[model samples]
Target chain A: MDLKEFARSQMQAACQYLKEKNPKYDWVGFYVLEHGKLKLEAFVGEKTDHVEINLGDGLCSLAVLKNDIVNEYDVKSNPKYLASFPSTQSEIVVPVRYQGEPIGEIDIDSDKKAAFSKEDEAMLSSIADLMAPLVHEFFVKLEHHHHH
Target chain B: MDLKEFARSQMQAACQYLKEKNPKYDWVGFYVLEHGKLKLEAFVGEKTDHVEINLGDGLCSLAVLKNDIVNEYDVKSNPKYLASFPSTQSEIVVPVRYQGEPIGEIDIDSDKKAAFSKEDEAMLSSIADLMAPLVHEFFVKL
Candidate 1:
């Protein structure tokens, strides 16, 4: 399989696995960052209208900007939080990096308050770390094909 | 947006909407057909090991080969049915055609027995028809 297909397959597997592994993990999704925007590439969750988000738009931005995990124990507490769903009480965004540059991220949402523990955060971060190469390849392939 | 991105967004929307619209729709997913296999692309629900399947392997294949909606009120009755989740009691597979040629299909599974009705079938069939162009593009892009 090509890089795109292979990456997408692995993406689906991880999304499904993470969501299934934790009842509190109501939503699990992968977003590919490009040109300072996050594209909702693959996800397993309720319908969300926030498909394309500017880097400065949501909690996801904080993760990308900090180049670290952003675990919001209370989504509503932050006025800047981009509400994807009304029931989203908490969220965890892990920046998936390549070398020292952030290429994409793993965004997870839960309906329960203070849902994610440090262990949960670590597991997702590892998944994010694993996905770094795939996202970089995807970005790399796009740039190669565009030839701009 | 590019066709690939746009299609995936719509696919996700439909999957999520359908699963949340009715309690019976426990699992919803799309599979793209190639030379003689199906690739699980977008989905909403539990993890499924049936990522790829032979054209002759699952009920999804039946829908594509027959070029019609395969509404199995009871999946367990037919031993040929491919089980994605253990609790799935019934299923509906709608063939997505492009210019009269089958390109892919929408597969929905429910934990409730005899879950889908004529209304559900019609709604899902219309969705499949609308998704024809997207599914066609995926095939061509493949």
Candidate 2:
């Protein structure tokens, strides 16, 4: 008679699990693209003021806009990097896609510049792949709520 | 017309602001009472494995069932602690209420035992007050 502990555990574990696997990543988070903006869904790091980022505004937004990965080595110098923490030296943003379009993104920030590699991108891209279906489930629930 | 970033900022800020205010709290999070369960809505801390808790199962649920705050001094000794991190020594659960009924809860875990006080309870209760309307708005929007 209880509703299952659905996406919450899976998504939160992904945040923890990925952050642990990659030591360079000081911060790892999930941003769900809703109504053309990115909404902070899950994260493991210092709290960010930029909870809702508009499309094309930051690296995460840029990833969604381009429908590809946005990797920046120097966040402080990169104009595209939306500054949250001064300690953030690098960042990688990968869009979680559904039907070849972005539904969300997996964003990782590191204290070391030029920290992420193709391996990191591929790892996060797989995470993004894992996330799309779950995010779709969330939207499906929302849609169900809308109809009901 | 863009939908205002109403609940997003408030809810996110609540987690960040409250955790910063109390060093005892190693973890701060919110759980929305949805579909007869607590869904992890937001959090500021080490990621938790126990993200979704069933109603009448954990301390968070106990707060909703009692319609009052559930403050545990030693989580290790408590049957409803639902262990996540071994470092979590204490916890406080405050239900976010609308019209005098719980809609959600603010759950805080600390590394130090007996970390919560009446003052801490009062502060988080006020936070629950601030959060209730915003969370209600979120559910409304959802």
Candidate 3:
């Protein structure tokens, strides 16, 4: 089987698994980073307020600027947080890429606080990076709106 | 190239890059997750506290469960965060994976908070994820 195909199937399966297991995870989706913008990719959750956004101005920006994982324990605490989901109390953002170049990221939201921690970040960020390249390529192949 | 070799190389490259550009990033490393457990992979910086852990327990578990990156703007405020560096005021953990399954993750300690945001999470998680499959394969090869 093709490597890309394997990844796509796995991503879809993973999202479905996440939805089934965690009800707090209102929106579980993937977003690509292109020319300093976050474009939605594959996701399984409730609707998202931010389907697309530029850097630093949104939740994705906070994660990318620091080049580290960002967890919004309470979106209410940060009034500036883009309302991706009305119920999103806690959210985590992880970046994905090949080498050191920017490609895209994984965004997960939950309706709880202290919902994410150092351990959680580690588990998810690592996964996001491993799967980013082929997914980016896939998006390009599809000519999905956002391109850099 | 071996998975551990690849992991070490990437960790080294990232450490070197940040060491030069951001001196505050004193410690950098990788933590591999297997079957809902976290084990130290390859790393740079100071020693880690709570060397080994189970899933749904601490920061690693939270990361895996939420499937979201985590950033501690102030570690003191977070009781669940396991301190890796004493002077560390902030911490960042991005998830790692094999194919689509969650494997392990990348962890960064900083002296600042709110230090990491969504953008940081996005990139960090992405890097961590990139490492997942390799680590999984490495174990299989070993």
Candidate 4:
């Protein structure tokens, strides 16, 4: 199998794990940083329209810009939060960094306000850490493949 | 921006559509034909290990061999049926053909015996028709 297949399967499995981990975790997805834009990747929840988020457009961007985790209790209260669906009350964006640089992120949405806990952030951040180099490898390989 | 993105999105959307179309569609997925092997591409349901199927290994392979849809009322009764889950009592494998050649196929599993209907077959066949060329393009572009 190609590295892309493994990368895609990893993200799908990751999304599925987080989605089923909690009842409040209504949506879970990954967005890979490609050409300076966060493009949607494997997801395991209701399909969303916010596939590609600009570097400074939404909370996803904020996490990357700040190079930290973003856990919002109520998305509706935060004007910086981008809404793909109306039922989303909370969200958590964890940057998937490679060598101290943000390469991608895992985004999760919840239907209940104050849904995410500190444990959730730590859990997601751990998963993001595990995904760092593989995510980097996929993009790097994709770029080189195009050169051929 | 490439055709792969559209191809993937189409498969994902199609999987989601089939999964949500009916509750009986317990599992919905697409297996793309690659180098004479059926490899799992997109799916919406419980994670399964039946990703790669060789030619003549299972019902998916049978559909391509026959160039016709394989609808099994009870997979247990058919020894030729290769099952990945115990809950799957019925199955429908519709060959996704391009230019009369099976390029890929849509596989749906249900928890109830004789779950698939004539209407289900026709609807899924049309979806397979829609996916045939895109499935072909994805592999060709790959």
Candidate 5:
């Protein structure tokens, strides 16, 4: 498969894998940082039918600003958070990087508090290694494809 | 309050946290990759008198080449591996990036095989993100 094909295939696998692993994880997705905003790449779980965000406007945005993984153990405690649902007590935002960057993030949602941990980061790092390139390619290629 | 102060503080906290959670983790620190080389940034555990390494020359290089997290469950498993000690069975290397560029990494050493987990990767990524600019600043201001 070519790069585009590879990206699609990997994205599908990633979405499927996360969905299968946890039931309470209501949303498993990737949202690339684009032109200072987030655009969904691939997703599974309940449909995020009514939400879109800028880099500094939501939980995902704060994760990028923090330049780190974000896990809202209790959304109620974080006043800066953007709630995707009334029950989103916890979340995980793992940045997908290539040669050290904020290209985008691997995001997961849980109905309870503190659903992610240190081990989850390691696993997602392994998973992101496989996916980061695809994400980078899509953005870089999309830009080139559109501009030229 | 400053970037450097915050950077050191985060690295220190991470080192202690990892060491406490994973007893074999002897060192958890940050190293910057600059102009094709690896330079020690901050660290916890035994004082590492030996620092500043070239690309492709150490285990840090291998992690860069792969551009991914590398876990050496047994440092002895690879003939070319660098050894801090004979009992050191595991090590983890994570690349640090800021806004989309690799500035350096977080290297963790442990006496247990496969000492790091996925969760560790997430936290380290956060730590690396927190440290990236401070690392970039070391060259900029200091």
Candidate 6:
């Protein structure tokens, strides 16, 4: 069995479970930094048009840029936020790191304003920590196999 | 949140959990027939080079072709089986239907011979039943 694939699949499942258990969250997804670009890896929300994001674009990009969590209580009000889904009012993006280098991020969008809490951020950070190295390995293999 | 993405994500999670919990299951994955090709939607356990499988090509393909559960105890002996992973000795493929037509399938590979039981197939069938319409909707949206 490929443990790397298992890790990514697990992350996708966790996103679904997180969305279901939490009433505030409307969307949950992962954005992996591939070739310095934030690419949507797996998501548990609407099929988004915003599949690939630039390096310095939005909260997700900023999270990867800063190598930290970026929580916006009101995305609609924030001029810096890049609007994707219309219903999204709040968002949280937590960077996943391996060997102190940022790799990807866990991004959550909520319909309710100020939907994310310190607890939620902590939980997601923990999950991201668990996923970072695995994702790194997964992508490395993908790059090698695909010759990308 | 889009419920369709949730359904796909949940299926992905279930595959991971199944692989972790079951000692016999070496690999678990979902294959959705997109544009007449069985595409690997979500998977756990191993990275596969075989992404798009044709109808009647392998066990997974045959499951879609037959529109039923196809369980093989010994893949090595089965002539119809298309070997992808060398370690896989046994396999089970259950078709997911929409409006009485096969749209996708749940495919599991085991390292041990005769790994799956009636209970396992039943449990997987139930999960496949739950996922059919959701996966159907997901692919529809995609």
Point to the candidate with the largest DockQ.
6
lDDT by residue for model 5 over A3-116, one digit each (tens)? 344354446556666766656577788887666667777888777853456656566876667767877788878897766767788888888777777777788888878877
Better of 2 and 6 by DockQ: 6
| Ten contiguous residues with the weakest lDDT in model 2 chain B | B1-10
DockQ of 4: 0.02
**Tens-digit lDDT track of model 1 for B45-98:** 998898887778778888988999999998988787656788989999998887
Over the stretch B1-142, how does candidate 3's per-residue lDDT look in tens digits? 1325544554455444444445556667666664446777666776776566766666666776776777777886878665666787877777766656556666778877657777667656655554455556433211
The CA lDDT of each predicted structure is: 0.77, 0.74, 0.64, 0.78, 0.68, 0.77
Q: Which regions of candidate 5 deviate over 4 angstroms?
A: A49-51, A141-148, B1-142
lDDT of 4 by residue, A60-112 (tens): 89888898998889889888656788999998899988778888888889999
Listed for every candidate in order, the interface RMSD values in angstroms are 14.3, 15.1, 12.7, 14.8, 14.7, 10.4
**Per-residue lDDT for A1-148 in model 6, tens only?**
3444545675677676778878998888888877667788778988888888877777878897788999999988888666679999998999888778788888899989999889888877766764554456434312554675
| Better candidate number, 2 or 4, judged by TM-score | 4
Per-prediction share of native contacts kept = 0.00, 0.00, 0.04, 0.00, 0.00, 0.18
lDDT assessment of candidate 3: 0.64
How good is the docking of model 6, by CAPRI class?
Answer: incorrect
Would you give me the overall lDDT of model 4?
A: 0.78
- Report how far residue B116 has shifted in candidate 1, in Å: 0.8
Q: What is the lDDT of residue B135 in candidate 5?
A: 54
Instruction: Compute each candidate's TM-score over C-alphas.
Output: 0.48, 0.47, 0.47, 0.49, 0.46, 0.52
Per-residue lDDT, model 3, residue A116, is 78
Q: Which stretches of candidate 4 lie over 4 Å from their true place?
A: A1-148, B140-142
Worst 10 residues of 2 chain A by lDDT: A1-10
Q: Relative to the unseen true structure, what is the C-alpha lDDT of residue A89 in candidate 2, on a scale of 0 to 100?
A: 92
Tens digit of per-residue lDDT, candidate 2, span B85-139: 8998888889888788888888999999999999888767765764565565434
Name the runs in model 1 displaced over 4 angstroms.
A1-148
